[PDB]
Scaffold this active site. Structure first.
Site, mmCIF file in Angstrom:
data_model
loop_
_atom_site.group_PDB
_atom_site.id
_atom_site.type_symbol
_atom_site.label_atom_id
_atom_site.label_comp_id
_atom_site.label_asym_id
_atom_site.label_seq_id
_atom_site.Cartn_x
_atom_site.Cartn_y
_atom_site.Cartn_z
ATOM 1 C CB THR D 42 -11.277 -73.276 -39.378
ATOM 2 O OG1 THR D 42 -11.975 -74.526 -39.311
ATOM 3 C CG2 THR D 42 -9.797 -73.501 -38.984
ATOM 4 C CE1 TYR D 129 -15.426 -75.325 -42.531
ATOM 5 C CE2 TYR D 129 -15.612 -74.837 -40.208
ATOM 6 C CZ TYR D 129 -14.889 -74.799 -41.375
ATOM 7 O OH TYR D 129 -13.625 -74.244 -41.404
ATOM 8 C CE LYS D 153 -15.285 -72.975 -44.851
ATOM 9 N NZ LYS D 153 -14.754 -72.314 -43.636
#
Ligand SMILES: [Mg+2]
Ligand SMILES: [Mg+2]
Lengths: 288, 288, 288, 288
Positions: D42, D129, D153
């Site tokens: 991001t 993610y 993550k």
């Protein structure tokens, strides 16, 4: 590092509060390391209790310990004020309240005025009970900066949110109310106000002690078990599950909750005991 | 097309319910076209009222009309049952309750059992009050399919949600509780239970009449005005604002709400009157 | 009352857009009463399409009709600008864009600047595509008062939210994007931009014509069946289901969607077709 | 305890990626103790980058280090697969992807199939993610038990959510993505993938080393300052602020972000720099 228990309110089969079970239960928690008792909190069915019941809970506990935080919230500020005047006559840790609830879209100034009136009348330290998932409102530091707050019980999964109180309100004690974040709260906040202290007090107490010794991994491992329990209890209704587990883990009866907080049926209670058995074994092996 | 008013509960400066203002107010609403009265709903401070207050509200209104839906919800099913037995002794439209509230993460079976006990004991038609934004729970048709439901009051901005009750529960009457969707509810549902009927009953009644004549554009135009009002009131606290507006629009005093639902102060009340004046002019021009 | 179709983008089994199928489908839609085609909207997998795929969809459709609204949203304004300059040389109805998406916590000013830049370069009427549930942002009228907005497609379940645009933005055409609120939108806004127009255009054109004739009961009856279809399609993925249903209802192949928007497997397609059979017969019994 | 950096993607004023700046920045980060670089996350404007820009970021960084986790998410699986095959020929730590995004109401099976396809083709360790707040989807362990996941993550404020992965997925490395929970993550998970490592890597490396030495009070003190920075950056846009702060704290130009992620104007940059001055001095007084 303070370990506070939002003590459950024992009810009998007719939904009448049993002050004798309340006293028995309180003694055991103190004896097992619980530092203070949050009276009439969510776990003790606060908003379900009439003003007289809230008062009777405090009177009964006052025979066991004076380390009591008295939660007095209701949707009638007159009744709230009444309990506060009553509590000013006693030697307790403080008085507390969650924000107004149910009514959606109330102005923020309504929340500020509610607490401001509690503070005007109370001669005790003010404890703010912030539980957004339940009341629908988050009490920001903006509002608290005026009031004479001693402590904040923050039931919230975002630890940075609890830590933000610490930061913005110098001198105030902050305790997180989540069972699944106990470990973290003991490494950053002033303590916890966790419902699981009702049935596994020695376990949460053991976490604090292991952390004081520097054995974090042992504390963390105990948190894994606590979290697995959390997942199982959700299915049955946490508060209602606790009543069953206090008997199982502590060896004495604390009755039943009161409907709409329905008690687990015998088939459900046995299903819970079967499902947590492996976790109980592991716990009593690492704690005793 | 039924126009139901969740009547406000007038309180005096000391927070005591004023049954005389309640009766005066009820007569005016009936006289102006309101078809039935929802007693002790959110707008009438239901959850803030003790069981005795809920009962006294029904007794006082029962002198004016029998077209009463009696809301009896509380966080103690014993008190709920008490009010229900009491209401079975009277000739009313029905009994109603919102779901259990405050307590988060309660199993769905808890919601089903709560209503199931109301139905077991009540001899009146069951009205389900579904207000998720307030209680934290949405009551799905799954649960209602067993119960003997007559009506559902659905306070929700999603009209398809209200319409889904109609679809899944043949024979049940559905009324949407949003002020900003009145127009739409009158074109698809069995009516409305809208708080704005407390101060602008003739306006909502006019909408229904214009729709019966086929003058939708006139009904829609009235909705624009209602919605603009909705935006203004949010700022002051809608329920508390209504008390001021009932005096302004209907010419009689209905007292004040009770804290934590704080009354508007005189500076706030005047600020509200100034801000809605243009809307009042437009309304009284299109309705009279 | 206008019926705009957010036309799907037919893909072949290799994830390549099928221009021939796109033209055949659009052709049928216009013939069946669709007023305009919204290109590259959510239903057309807008954000899953590359700059060039968006462009080639407009080119393909431009060989069929001039009633096209060209959506050009992406997370690189340079690419949005390129698409805008491309469309400036074409005789279509307008250019559109949903708000920036994915990134959370972007300041509101970013949303304003995104749109100001589009308006600064576009020589076409601007259409705001508001879909909070997809983008995570709601475009408020505040921002829109500065822009020369001609229309707004509002995919929102709160009909009051769409209606608020009509009020604060005089002269702007407002359309609602929900399939489950079509009936209401045709009774209050400038039209609808509904995904279901892809496979049941005649049904939605019939609602529009029945309402134009004052037969609201018949239009609401059709809405009830639409809403039942909506429940069914959710299990399978609405956009993905629409492809199977276009073939089923209209008689031609529109290919498959492109994964992550997965096509229904053969088994899921038969399952879907069985569930909707009863609804299809009731529909085809009321339309034609 | 590992400190992974979701490295930003430097752009020049024309929205073209600046490879030279990207390499200089990564170089500094590794030198300052960063354990690995997460490419196209991001913070690196992942979803705003084209297939080729994602690829060229990996290529640029591959000339600097081998400790790279390659995020390849897009809304066209064909493109994700192409990127996966590209990275299969490179000696990096792993390949990653966040879930499909934008489209709401996609069935869970779509999320599973998206990932199954990546695992079927990747010859690298898989990194999930999870960023519910960005994608609108939470990847539950249910789905992950079928995949050969090496790491996760989890950008989530509920530390219990990250901790649950450790429990249900033995042997999987779990990292939390929040800057405001760094201290807690280093005390319970395998590490952190925090955006702030971009401009204060030494601070976060210091927290890790202080904790390794048992000095938790000093690591928590640094966390308090991080959390104060977080509040400040939100006003300006965190990702956009990070660019200004990298230059400010590290001494080199990392260019500008690319709109819709707008760069801070000259005025906003000075404003930002003034707000953080007191915090920068307290930080640089505790680190070094
Ligand atoms: Mg051509
Ligand atoms: Mg190279």
């Amino acid at each position: 590092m303070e370990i506070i228990s939002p003590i459950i309110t024992p009810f009998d089969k007719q939904g009448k509060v049993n002050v004798d079970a309340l006293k028995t239960h309180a003694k055991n928690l103190l004896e097992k390391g619980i530092d203070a008792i949050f009276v009439n909190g969510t776990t003790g069915l606060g908003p379900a209790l009439s003003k007289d019941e809230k008062r009777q809970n405090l009177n009964a506990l006052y025979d066991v310990t004076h380390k009591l935080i008295f939660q007095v919230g209701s949707l009638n500020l007159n009744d709230v004020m009444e309990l506060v005047k009553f509590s000013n006559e006693m030697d307790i840790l403080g008085v507390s309240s969650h924000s107004p609830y149910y009514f959606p879209r109330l102005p923020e100034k309504f929340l500020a005025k509610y607490y401001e009136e509690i503070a005007r009348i109370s001669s005790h330290s003010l404890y703010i009970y912030n539980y957004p998932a339940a009341t629908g409102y988050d009490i920001p530091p903006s509002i608290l900066k005026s009031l004479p707050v001693k402590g904040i019980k923050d039931t919230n999964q975002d630890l940075a949110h609890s830590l933000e109180y610490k930061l913005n309100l110098p001198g105030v004690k902050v305790y997180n109310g989540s069972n699944t974040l106990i470990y973290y709260s003991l490494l950053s906040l002033d303590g916890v106000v966790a419902s699981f202290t009702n049935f596994i007090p020695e376990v949460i107490v053991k976490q604090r002690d292991l952390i004081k010794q520097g054995k974090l991994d042992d504390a963390l491992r105990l948190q894994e078990l606590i979290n697995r329990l959390a997942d199982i209890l959700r299915k049955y209704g946490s508060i209602s599950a606790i009543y069953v587990l206090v008997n199982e883990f502590q060896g004495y009866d604390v009755g039943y909750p009161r409907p709409p907080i329905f008690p687990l049926t015998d088939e459900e209670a046995l299903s819970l005991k079967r499902e947590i058995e492996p976790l109980k074994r592991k716990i009593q092996e690492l704690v005793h």
